[PDB]
């Protein structure tokens, strides 16, 4: 069963779920460990798991697949991957991996992944022979991230300010230097909202840190 | 003629299978789980046990 319909689905359903399949009493506990039991029950009853997530690697070996909702933090919902993956398919901390998984016995209480299906939204063929990061050569921008959605709402004249003020393209480095107080929060979420609408074939990510 | 005679060799030999049967019985039920292109046969085998 895939990960992300019972990740992204409201508590409820999980809870309805869990007291459908005839377990423990099931909402007394954490969203983590509730759909844990609930994957354990359905993998007790039913056929291999399918989970997805980002890969991290510690300086012990193996690395953690971790979801996006719980901000990628330890848990029961963690997917465990040997040093076997990173060695075969030489993995790397921060890949976006998805595939099959299977669960744990005696001594281990993390799914085990057992056939990786999509790395990065990539082939692991095509991924084997890459090109690192780092080793990559920068430039300056020259697609230039149109910022107007041209609907001419009454706060997107605040986009349409920035683009008379800074205009943005594809490798741009922004440094929005403002004071407390002063109307920032929608700012971003507007620039967001626009360059989504405008731009949805480019990934957008937001981190909002303390 | 009826009496052998055996030195440190086959004994170290004999206590060397004992250990690898033990550890060959460990690994067999290992594999029984086990699947393709997984591991490597490396960590199949404890060395603790020899
Ligand atoms: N474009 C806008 N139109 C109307 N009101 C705005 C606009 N931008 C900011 N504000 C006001 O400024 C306030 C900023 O609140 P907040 O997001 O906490 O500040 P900051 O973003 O600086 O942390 C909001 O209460 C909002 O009413
Ligand atoms: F500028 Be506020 F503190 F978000
Ligand atoms: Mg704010």
């Given at each position: 069963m895939n990960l992300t319909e019972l990740k992204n689905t409201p508590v409820s359903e999980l809870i309805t779920l869990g007291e459908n399949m005839g377990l423990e009493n099931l909402a007394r506990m954490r969203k983590q460990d509730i759909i844990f039991a609930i994957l354990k029950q359905h993998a007790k009853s039913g056929e291999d798991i399918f989970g997805d997530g980002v890969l991290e690697i510690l300086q012990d070996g193996f690395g953690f697949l971790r979801s996006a909702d719980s901000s990628y933090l330890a848990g029961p919902d963690?997917?465990?991957?040997?040093?076997?993956?990173?060695?075969?398919?030489?993995?790397?901390?921060?890949?976006?991996?998805?595939?099959?998984?299977?669960?744990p016995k005696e001594g281990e209480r993390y799914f085990a992944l057992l056939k990786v299906n999509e790395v990065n939204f990539d082939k692991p063929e095509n991924a084997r022979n890459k090109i690192l990061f780092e080793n990559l050569t920068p430039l300056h921008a020259n697609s230039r991230?149109?910022?107007?959605?041209?609907?001419?709402?009454?706060?997107?004249?605040?986009?349409?300010?920035?683009?008379?003020?800074?205009?943005?393209?594809?490798?741009?480095?922004?440094?929005?230097?403002?004071?407390?107080?002063?109307?920032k929060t929608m700012l971003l979420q507007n620039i967001a909202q626009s360059?989504?609408?405008?731009?949805?074939?480019?990934?957008?990510?937001?981190?909002?840190?303390? | 003629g009826n009496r052998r005679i055996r030195s440190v060799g086959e004994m170290a030999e004999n206590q060397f299978r004992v250990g690898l049967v033990r550890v060959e019985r460990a690994v067999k039920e290992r594999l029984s789980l086990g699947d393709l292109d997984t591991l490597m046969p490396q960590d199949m085998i404890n060395a603790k046990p020899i």
């Amino acid at each position: 069963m895939n990960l992300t319909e019972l990740k992204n689905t409201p508590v409820s359903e999980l809870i309805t779920l869990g007291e459908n399949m005839g377990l423990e009493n099931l909402a007394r506990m954490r969203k983590q460990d509730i759909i844990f039991a609930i994957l354990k029950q359905h993998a007790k009853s039913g056929e291999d798991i399918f989970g997805d997530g980002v890969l991290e690697i510690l300086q012990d070996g193996f690395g953690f697949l971790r979801s996006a909702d719980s901000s990628y933090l330890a848990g029961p919902d963690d997917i465990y991957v040997s040093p076997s993956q990173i060695r075969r398919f030489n993995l790397r901390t921060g890949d976006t991996i998805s595939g099959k998984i299977r669960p744990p016995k005696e001594g281990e209480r993390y799914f085990a992944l057992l056939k990786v299906n999509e790395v990065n939204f990539d082939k692991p063929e095509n991924a084997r022979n890459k090109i690192l990061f780092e080793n990559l050569t920068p430039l300056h921008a020259n697609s230039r991230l149109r910022m107007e959605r041209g609907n001419g709402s009454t706060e997107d004249l605040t986009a349409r300010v920035l683009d008379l003020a800074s205009p943005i393209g594809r490798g741009q480095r922004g440094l929005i230097v403002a004071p407390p107080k002063a109307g920032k929060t929608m700012l971003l979420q507007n620039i967001a909202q626009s360059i989504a609408y405008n731009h949805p074939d480019c990934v957008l990510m937001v981190l909002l840190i303390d | 003629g009826n009496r052998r005679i055996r030195s440190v060799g086959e004994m170290a030999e004999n206590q060397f299978r004992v250990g690898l049967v033990r550890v060959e019985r460990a690994v067999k039920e290992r594999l029984s789980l086990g699947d393709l292109d997984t591991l490597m046969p490396q960590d199949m085998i404890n060395a603790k046990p020899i």
